[PDB]
């Protein structure tokens, strides 16, 4: 039910190669094998709709001079540079490539996908090459039609339960903003009390503080500043009693139970 | 578009039910107040078709027998049972469970009822297997109202954890192991390549389908793994703690993925 997907690799080592082969084995990878710049350049520009993703090598001779030219003839697709010389520290080609090293070429399969969803993701990509300043390329729009493309063979449609962006706390007026905030607050430091307490209710206070927390839409790094706040609180109250403030670190136990619960409900929430 | 939501709360004390209407004063909420469980249980035989979301009060007298009726007649609907905070199976699987303390943002909590309910029909009733798709009728009804149409990238569902082999099980768990490995290593020095390391292992537990638990279970096998090699070194396996902040972190990241994956 899946769409073949055809991979072009730009590789001059046997044993690269021989891993890329073995991790993309399955009758679903069609691989095109490039052994020089010169191939690579001259099948892209012949098959520039017939490539899904490219896997490139950053230490083959040229590589930057090829992907150069391949920015220049507007061949603009889902990409792995593998490796480094030119594992990569900076981005060489666009916007949406994956970086993969060398050792790593068995994720190959999953690393395939997550470069063709990056790439759907964020097309029209910006090119390294092309662009250098911030914000073919107006007709480089030839990136939407190969996206439009591709999400027709690797896109599937599903329902969703629909969330009243009015109410997610970043579109809230600043009042009600604050009272979402502070229930928010008052449901996690009912977590916090009860964490480590036996035979408490600490699985429907932690539904509730999710709940909240996905309805709301709101981003991991605010239930971290929540958190924060309630150990700023806990902090206070330890140290007007005597107790040390180390027990405070085992509540990123807490932290990460409820971080979970919130990931879990965005996995649990994808169709199909 | 939202559509209007039709609340029906069998509630008999005064606080809870200003609570209620405090909560769900906004007008996308229609409330139906129900004082007995007779009249809950005449209410809900003939508008039957007419209730979004139940609001039940647990201590209510009857409340066993009252929910039983209900689902004996096969009125079974989303739900929110407040108070006993209960800790188990009152009326069915789908159904949430609120403190009468909880309450103040009873909104988001309709919305969770509903959309578990959604996510689980046909689902199990706590008060009892064919014509017991009267649920996938309601069920859809509810969807064309309260759902959208959105795309999401195919993952293949072959190499979903749950679904491979016991080889390419074990593979999978080695190749996510080395990677966080390389979290780990990374974290905490300077001009690593800390980002893209997080990536690549979010990258196989995005794809891959993998419950967070399985995050929970590598980060902690890889803890194992170091607190061996720090005894062998004479030191002290606190220092592991610190590596919280990692897990912390690698969540986060996976979660925001999931997160920013969702369509409009």
Known sequence: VLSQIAICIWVESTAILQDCQRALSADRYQLQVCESGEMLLEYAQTHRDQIDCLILVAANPSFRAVVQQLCFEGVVVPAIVVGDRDPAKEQLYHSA????????????????????????????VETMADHIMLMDPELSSQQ???????????????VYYKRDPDRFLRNLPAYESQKLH?????????????????????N?????????????DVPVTKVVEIHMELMDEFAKKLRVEGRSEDILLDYRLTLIDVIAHLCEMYRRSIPR
């Not at 994720?107 to 029209?124: C, G, I, K, M, S």
């Not at 939407?144 to 599903?158: I, T």
């Not at 429907?204 to 709940?211: A, C, G, K, L």
């Open 97 to 124: 490539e994956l970086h993969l090293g060398i050792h790593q070429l068995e994720q190959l399969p999953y690393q395939v996908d997550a470069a063709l969803a990056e790439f759907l993701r964020l097309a029209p």
């Open 144 to 158: 939407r039609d190969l996206a439009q493309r591709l999400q027709e063979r690797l896109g599937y449609l599903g």
């Open 182 to 202: 502070q229930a928010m607050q008052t449901s996690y430091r009912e977590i916090v009390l009860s964490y480590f307490s036996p035979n408490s209710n600490l």
């Open 204 to 216: 429907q206070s932690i539904d509730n503080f999710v709940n909240m927390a996905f309805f709301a």
